[PDB]
């Protein structure tokens, strides 16, 4: 069997990986590290008018989540960017120019969702890189599928990665898991090798 | 004994439950998921005037935690709503109409508190449901006691739950654990079955 000291080592290593942003890979799309969205190059935000911000009871304005939130680590239910329908896109200026090796997408767990269903999750998606920061025509880096029956956090490795560098990338959502009104993106990460 | 593979499975399952809001139950009182307080139907906030917000050194206004914070997941010391004395109440519009099956209350751990005491914690409490959203007379769903000697997060199952649905609920604090000035509520959750 295993010894007591061995069990403690296994637990220590597991919690250290947990504390390293769960997956232990640097994220060049993290907003606090220097990444940002290019708002004019994202899908229109799904505006719902169900959340009202006020002062002293007097109405003010509606509350909605902007594309910035896909670059932010809080992923409690509703801390997600929504666009209308099952196709949408977001363009991100990474914090540094890198050779991308993987991306990570996550969604809220089924256990924290009504009826244990996450139909607003992205399904098929594609990642594009823009060699020149201001060019409008991107290069396909990879196509993947977020598995609604998989772990909440899923990492996707570029199958045959072609080592040039990029600082501007696009997350293009092609389908969702069946929600008839919107698609929700909780957090998008980009991993790779710096210069 | 146990095998190495078995230890890894146990740790994996434990961290997955940890990541699912610690308890793996959807929370219909979570603000980001669509819940909100009815401010005119909560206790007056304990206002202390010890926290001053300013700009360039010029005084501005006092900082205090509103009842919204009981619907928010950050539970570091002081990220709690306080009311004066040992009796108080908060009314919450849940994110959906549900059949309530349990509630969860948590407090800061003794280890993070001076003298390892949490006398501001709620003690005896009761949960009421308001069948019609605008009615002022509630139905008792259950009476429980938060155990200051128990785990920081405590879940309470409605002992004989009587399946109608509610969207408006009240947390009524009847006693606290002895603090002579105030009672502090860190986070309140409501669990149940949607329609």
């Amino acid at each position: 069997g295993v010894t007591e000291e061995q069990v403690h080592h296994i637990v220590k290593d597991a919690l250290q990986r947990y504390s390293e942003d769960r997956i232990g890979l640097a994220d060049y799309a993290l907003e606090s590290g220097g990444a940002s969205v290019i708002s004019t190059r994202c899908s229109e935000t799904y505006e719902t008018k169900t959340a009202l911000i006020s002062l002293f009871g007097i109405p003010l304005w509606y509350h909605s989540q902007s594309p910035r939130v896909i670059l932010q680590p809080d992923v409690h239910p509703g801390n997600c960017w929504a666009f209308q329908g099952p196709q949408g896109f977001a363009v991100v200026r990474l914090s540094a120019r890198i050779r991308p090796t993987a991306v990570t997408l996550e969604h809220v767990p089924k256990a924290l969702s009504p009826n244990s269903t996450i139909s607003s999750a992205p399904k098929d998606f594609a990642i594009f890189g823009f060699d020149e920061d201001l060019q409008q025509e991107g290069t396909l880096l990879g196509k993947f599928t977020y598995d609604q029956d998989g772990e909440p956090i899923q990492t996707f490795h570029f199958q045959a990665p072609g080592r040039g560098t990029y600082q501007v990338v696009e997350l293009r959502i092609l389908t969702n898991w069946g929600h008839p009104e919107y698609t929700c993106i909780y957090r998008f990460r980009v991993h790779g090798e710096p210069a | 004994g146990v095998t190495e593979e078995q230890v890894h499975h146990i740790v994996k399952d434990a961290l997955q439950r940890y990541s699912e809001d610690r308890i793996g139950l959807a929370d219909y009182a979570l603000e980001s998921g669509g819940a909100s307080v009815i401010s005119t139907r909560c206790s007056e906030t304990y206002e202390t005037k010890t926290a001053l917000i300013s700009l360039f050194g010029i005084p501005l206004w006092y900082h205090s935690q509103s009842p919204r914070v009981i619907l928010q997941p950050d539970v570091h010391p002081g990220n709690c709503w306080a009311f004066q004395g040992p009796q108080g109440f908060a009314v919450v519009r849940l994110s959906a109409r549900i059949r309530p099956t349990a509630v969860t209350l948590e407090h800061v751990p003794k280890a993070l508190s001076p003298n390892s005491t949490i006398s501001s914690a709620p003690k005896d409490f009761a949960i009421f449901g308001f069948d019609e959203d605008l009615q002022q007379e509630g139905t008792l769903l259950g009476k429980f006691t938060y155990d200051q000697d128990g785990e920081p997060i405590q879940t309470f199952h409605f002992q004989a739950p009587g399946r109608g649905t509610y969207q408006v609920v009240e947390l009524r604090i009847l006693t606290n654990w002895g603090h002579p000035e105030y009672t502090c509520i860190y986070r309140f959750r409501v669990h149940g079955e949607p329609a």
């Binding site: 799904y46 002062l55 | 669509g34 900082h63 205090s64 509103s66 919204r68 959906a96």
Partner: peptide, 16 residues
């Protein structure tokens, strides 16, 4: 000056 809080009210579920 006085105390203070933005208030948030939902009349329907936000996207999740």
């Amino acid at each position: 000056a006085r105390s203070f809080t933005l208030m948030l009210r939902y009349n329907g579920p936000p996207p999740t």
